[PDB]
Design a protein around this ligand. Sequence first.
Ligand SMILES: [Mg+2]
Ligand SMILES: [Mg+2]
Ligand SMILES: [Mg+2]
Ligand SMILES: [Mg+2]
Ligand SMILES: [Mg+2]
Ligand SMILES: [Mg+2]
Ligand SMILES: [Mg+2]
Ligand SMILES: [Mg+2]
Ligand SMILES: [Mg+2]
Ligand SMILES: [Mg+2]
Ligand SMILES: [Mg+2]
Ligand SMILES: [Mg+2]
Ligand SMILES: [Mg+2]
Ligand SMILES: [Mg+2]
Ligand SMILES: [Mg+2]
Ligand SMILES: [Mg+2]
Ligand SMILES: [Mg+2]
Ligand SMILES: [Mg+2]
Ligand SMILES: [Mg+2]
Ligand SMILES: [Mg+2]
Lengths: 220, 53, 62, 258, 106, 103
Amino acid sequence: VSILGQLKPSDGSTKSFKRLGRGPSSGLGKTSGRGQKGQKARGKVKSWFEGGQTPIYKLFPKIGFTNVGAKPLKELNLKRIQWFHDKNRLHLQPGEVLDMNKMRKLGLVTGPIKYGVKILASGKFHYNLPIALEASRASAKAIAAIEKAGGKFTARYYTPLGLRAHLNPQWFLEKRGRVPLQARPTKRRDIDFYSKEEKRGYLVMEKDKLLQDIKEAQNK
Amino acid sequence: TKFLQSKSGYLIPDYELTTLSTPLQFKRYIKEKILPSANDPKLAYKEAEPNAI
Amino acid sequence: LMKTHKGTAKRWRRTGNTFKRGIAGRKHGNIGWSHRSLKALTGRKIAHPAYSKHLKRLLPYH
Amino acid sequence: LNPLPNAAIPPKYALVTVRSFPSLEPLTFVPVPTSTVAAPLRRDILWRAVVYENDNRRVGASNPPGRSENGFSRRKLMPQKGSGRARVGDANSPTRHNGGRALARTAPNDYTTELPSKVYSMAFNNALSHQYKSGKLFVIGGEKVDLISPTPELDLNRLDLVNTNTVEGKEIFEGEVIFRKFLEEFQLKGKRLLFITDKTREGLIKSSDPYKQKVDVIQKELVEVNDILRAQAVFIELEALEYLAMAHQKEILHSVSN
Amino acid sequence: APIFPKLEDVKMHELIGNNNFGKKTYYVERSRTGNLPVYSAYKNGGNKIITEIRKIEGDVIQLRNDLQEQLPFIPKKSWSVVMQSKKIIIKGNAVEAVKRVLTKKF
Amino acid sequence: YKQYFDSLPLKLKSFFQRYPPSIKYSPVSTSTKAINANPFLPNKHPVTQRFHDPKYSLRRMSDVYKLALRYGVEEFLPPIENTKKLFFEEKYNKKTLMKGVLL
RNA sequence: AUAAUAAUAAUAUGGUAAUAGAACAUUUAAUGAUAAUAUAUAUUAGUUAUUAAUUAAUAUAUGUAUUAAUUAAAUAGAGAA
RNA sequence: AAGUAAUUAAUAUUAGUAAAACAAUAAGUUAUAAAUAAAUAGAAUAAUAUAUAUAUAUAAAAAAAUAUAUAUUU
RNA sequence: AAGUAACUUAAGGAUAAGAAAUCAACAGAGAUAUUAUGAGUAUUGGUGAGAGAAAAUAAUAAAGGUCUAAUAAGUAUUAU
Ligand SMILES: [Mg+2]
Ligand SMILES: [Mg+2]
Ligand SMILES: [Mg+2]
Ligand SMILES: [Mg+2]
Ligand SMILES: [Mg+2]
Ligand SMILES: [Mg+2]
Ligand SMILES: [Mg+2]
Ligand SMILES: [Mg+2]
Ligand SMILES: [Mg+2]
Ligand SMILES: [Mg+2]
Ligand SMILES: [Mg+2]
Ligand SMILES: [Mg+2]
Ligand SMILES: [Mg+2]
Ligand SMILES: [Mg+2]
Ligand SMILES: [Mg+2]
Ligand SMILES: [Mg+2]
Ligand SMILES: [Mg+2]
Ligand SMILES: [Mg+2]
Ligand SMILES: [Mg+2]
Ligand SMILES: [Mg+2]
């Protein structure tokens, strides 16, 4: 005969919902769990209403503010990179740079990348890859470990649209026939950060025209 | 298998074709499965009564 | 769909598997008291188990 | 020593006979993966798939009128005090003979349920494997694989019946006659039959129309676990089986190991 | 390569029934990424720590016996098997040890 | 070359129909009654001496110019110097940085 | 190293509000033989540790089960308004 | 004749997959790092807290509170 | 609660909206109308009960871009 009359669920995957108001011996009879009388017996009252005394959401003070200019970065530690290497899941052609695009493509950094990626140094003691790396920034220990392993790191600036173009350029090529030009830094914080050398800022590390334009502006 | 089924008049299931690997295995299966029902029409398999005795 | 209770949102923050809060009672009437004692009224505390359930219901998406 | 003495490498193929439709005559063996045709029976996975499909198939036409949609005026039938009779309000109360229904539903009731695609694919493989293990899965195909036995002149390599539209004979034509002859030759008359095809087979549809009560014809896109498990005999073209096996396949990347 | 290979491509010993895999032998598949299918789970609110071994085919009882022989430090009563899905459950965290044992063969 | 002219989008093709390349359109504002009046620029009416809004708004002009750049045809469109709008590489190159950024 | 049944020793089995497991009756959907020597309903008398089903006799209708069983769901159980 | 419906959040069990899961057109949501009101900060100098990260204080530490490291990443 | 119930008035097979004095942020998009994510986030409140978006990415959709105006004055803007 057909299996359709013999199918069964797996044990522990189904229960019986407690049935209310259907007999005394059911254990849930007339009161059906409500108890005896009260507002809760035949009415509705908030779960977090405490009878008038100053509530937990009023006694304490309002603390802090929300920084709308925040740029959260997905974290990537060095142990994951080394782990991919030893698993042979880090497919880099010789002389190729490991940037956010390749992190997404290989699976190092998974999920949506809103603003960027920051490289942290948790498996620094076992990191020995001489490859080159790119990201929004990295920790000082990560910089030290990457250089010690014979590698190279530089921190680059991306806007939302610029990072979208970086991660998925063929989308732009298909829809519009061209990839947008990466936007130059416009704030003070970005210019300062990427002009710092201890952060491995790309502006300073590549001596690009923007800093020269700023210098020609000041010297005038 | 094709000749055996053709000249026997019965279809041997493909799972048993894949599993069984010698002609004596084929003979044992055919004897133990098809011959009893053929000899005794009462001792047949009913689709609606799988676990019948 | 439920909505975050903004008062609790402003007065509480998520930390670890619980919530943090500021202290109450250090916004006036502080002169005349010991500084080494009022030090205990500066900073933050953690949510208490008596109201952890309330907080979880008040901040569903935290 | 040997840390895991009894470890072994499992099989990875099983044989299915390719045949021609009007007479199921074998032409060649074709190996098919065990994940497709020899999967262990998981009645729980099949249960998941069938419940999901059945829930999604519902209509939800239940529509009892409540005390708002019941058509009575919103007026107090009797004064609260002094009537000497129990207190009453409007005429829509559920406690009344022509009153509404308490906690009434409002069509279209939503009974849709969702289930992960991997689980659905696993259930589909399990149903196909169950049919193969029960020996009720027939594979009809050719013209794309090497045949070691030629196809008969009268037969075809496709799940179809040609020479049906030629009705300039008697009140009946060749299609239904051939279908009945197939039916009685293979001794399956009141048995559930399923015919999975690649493209529409109008000849087969027309020829099997008389037996609509027990024979179902579906394209590879629209088949379901319930159809496969309901059928007491399932016929599937080789290309359709290829397509379904590819679609409901476990995915593998790299995975290089010692 | 095509999902269904040609009849001449497949050897006799790759087919089911042959090579007697159905009797007192076992196998464990590595994950889609290429890692052992041994995992840690926290249950009953987080106070119950267990190790789960999955993607098994064959004789799970024999696999449990061999794993017990290779990890004698784990009490014999801490092992259990769920047959409907053929998983091995070990009370406590033993992911590293079970991986160390499995990787020698799988 | 039908199969290469027709591959162009509707906006660009209709623009060429309405404004053939044959006429050389002025780079500067002129009379609305002029033969070579540039659609992208606000012309001046000679009887009442008051400007007319461009026949092609800034959105539409940007769209057609971008499509023309995509498909290479540049000289065939009328000039866009006076329209205070630059595109892509040209803009990036001759963009003067902000006073805030520089100082 | 389980499951069923049985055997021995020991402990425990009152219960409102309440919590937690298990099962039965009704109806509907999926799979589903059998058939007037049967099915359904009703009454009387028996059986099974029995809200339920079953056996016999009698009465009515019907060539007959949304049947046994597994699932999914409820307008799913009334001396209390 | 009376605990039902949607739209959500938390918890528990089983099942699929698993350092990934759901989708697979692009996105997106959880998890993968803790912390701070926030900021350009972010876990072993040849080992288990006596090390390290964050917050308070900084020559730098110490001090309080959390959190991360003992063939294989959770 | 809510610009809801109700009353009043006026059209058509539909009405309404619609091709930027729009978004955005130095890189760019390119008309309306619904839907999912964004997101119960930004924002807001006897900072109570509570209310709450837009960019951007997708789905449905049509040929979706067009000229009819001498290019718009008690108008923009300002105060209340
Ligand atoms: Mg009780
Ligand atoms: Mg009382
Ligand atoms: Mg009462
Ligand atoms: Mg009470
Ligand atoms: Mg008071
Ligand atoms: Mg203060
Ligand atoms: Mg003191
Ligand atoms: Mg369901
Ligand atoms: Mg008791
Ligand atoms: Mg007692
Ligand atoms: Mg009822
Ligand atoms: Mg009654
Ligand atoms: Mg009673
Ligand atoms: Mg009564
Ligand atoms: Mg310190
Ligand atoms: Mg209109
Ligand atoms: Mg409103
Ligand atoms: Mg105007
Ligand atoms: Mg104007
Ligand atoms: Mg005003």
